[PDB]
Structures are given as structure tokens and as C-alpha cells.
Design an enzyme around this catalytic site. Structure first.
Site, PDB file in Angstrom:
ATOM      1  N   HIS A  91       0.813  -1.209   0.000  1.00  0.00           N
ATOM      2  CA  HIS A  91       0.000   0.000   0.000  1.00  0.00           C
ATOM      3  C   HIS A  91       0.850   1.263   0.000  1.00  0.00           C
ATOM      4  CE1 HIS A  91       0.010   2.303   3.810  1.00  0.00           C
ATOM      5  NE2 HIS A  91       0.160   1.169   4.471  1.00  0.00           N
ATOM      6  N   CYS A  92       0.300   2.308  -0.620  1.00  0.00           N
ATOM      7  CA  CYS A  92       0.821   3.660  -0.468  1.00  0.00           C
ATOM      8  C   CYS A  92      -0.358   4.567  -0.148  1.00  0.00           C
ATOM      9  CB  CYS A  92       1.591   4.120  -1.711  1.00  0.00           C
ATOM     10  SG  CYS A  92       0.693   4.222  -3.292  1.00  0.00           S
ATOM     11  N   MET A  93      -0.491   5.701  -0.833  1.00  0.00           N
ATOM     12  CA  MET A  93      -1.687   6.542  -0.702  1.00  0.00           C
ATOM     13  C   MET A  93      -1.723   7.514  -1.878  1.00  0.00           C
ATOM     14  SD  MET A  93      -0.938   9.173   2.469  1.00  0.00           S
ATOM     15  CE  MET A  93      -2.692   9.581   2.458  1.00  0.00           C
TER      16      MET A  93
END
Length: 146
Positions: A91-93
Site C-alpha cells: 500500500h501507499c496513498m
């Protein structure tokens, strides 16, 4: 967890889970690759540990590229977990370019895909998401080593 889009049978990528979402995500994944920086984190990565999830924190600033060596270390770690039978979340954003870069890299690393085909596969699962030119360059570097 509907935010997670799987790129093979065991590895998915997504936006950042909120703290309230951790109980849910932690029951769906065994390990998580966290690509956000500490100034983007709304909770301590302890909260994963407290829920039975092992963490690799590999920070990359938003819109920028990991180094190719940073990339390879993250890929080797994912592979380890996959070989253990575990499900892994990357995950990142934001615009999702960081997890996109790592997900494209994972397809090249694990399945032997060329960069251009790995890019096409991730591109279709994330309409409208792009990799920056810097992220494209390290992926090319990865292709030339892989």
C-alpha cells in the site's frame, strides 16, 4: 477488503487503510509492505503487529521513485512471504504511483514479465492511475537487471 486489488493469487495493492480498517485488513492479509512516509501515517505501524501482521516499512516520497536496490529488497521480501504461503498487501496513498511501481515490479520479478506488459496489466486494474517519469525510469533500470 474491496480497496485491495490483487495482481496475482497472493499479492494485492491498495490505498492506505485507516486505523478503523485495520482489524478488517489484518484478517485478510498476513504481511504488508508500507511505502508511505512517517509524515503520511495516521497511526503507528505497531498497530499491524498488534493484529498479527508482519510489516516491511519501505518509505518512498510521494510521486518519486524508489532506488532500484530499494525495489529489489522489497521484491525479495514479498517473495519470502509468498513462499511461506502468506498473502501480502502493498500500500501507499494518494495517486497510488508508489504501490503501482512496486506492483509492476513484482509482476516483472515473479512472473518474468517485460516492463511494457507488466505496466499494461497494472494499468487496467487502476483506471486513471499513472506512474511518474521518475518511476518509469527505475522500472526500466529494473528491467535491465532482472
Amino acid at each position: 477488503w474491496p480497496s485491495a486489488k490483487f495482481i496475482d493469487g497472493r499479492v494485492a495493492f491498495s490505498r492506505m487503510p485507516a486505523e478503523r480498517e485495520l482489524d478488517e485488513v489484518a484478517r485478510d492479509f498476513d504481511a504488508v509492505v508500507v511505502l508511505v512516509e512517517d509524515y503520511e501515517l495516521p497511526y503507528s505501524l505497531d498497530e499491524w503487529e498488534k493484529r498479527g501482521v508482519e510489516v516491511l516499512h519501505g518509505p518512498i516520497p510521494d510521486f518519486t521513485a524508489p532506488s532500484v536496490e530499494q525495489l529489489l529488497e522489497i521484491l525479495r521480501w514479498i517473495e519470502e512471504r509468498v513462499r511461506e504461503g502468506k498473502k501480502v498487501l502493498i500500500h501507499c496513498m494518494g495517486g497510488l504511483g508508489r504501490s503501482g511501481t512496486v506492483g509492476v515490479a513484482w509482476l516483472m520479478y515473479s512472473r518474468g514479465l517485460s516492463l511494457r506488459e507488466a505496466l499494461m496489466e497494472v494499468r487496467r486494474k487502476r483506471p486513471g492511475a499513472v506512474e511518474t517519469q521518475e518511476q518509469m525510469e527505475v522500472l526500466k533500470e529494473l528491467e535491465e537487471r532482472i
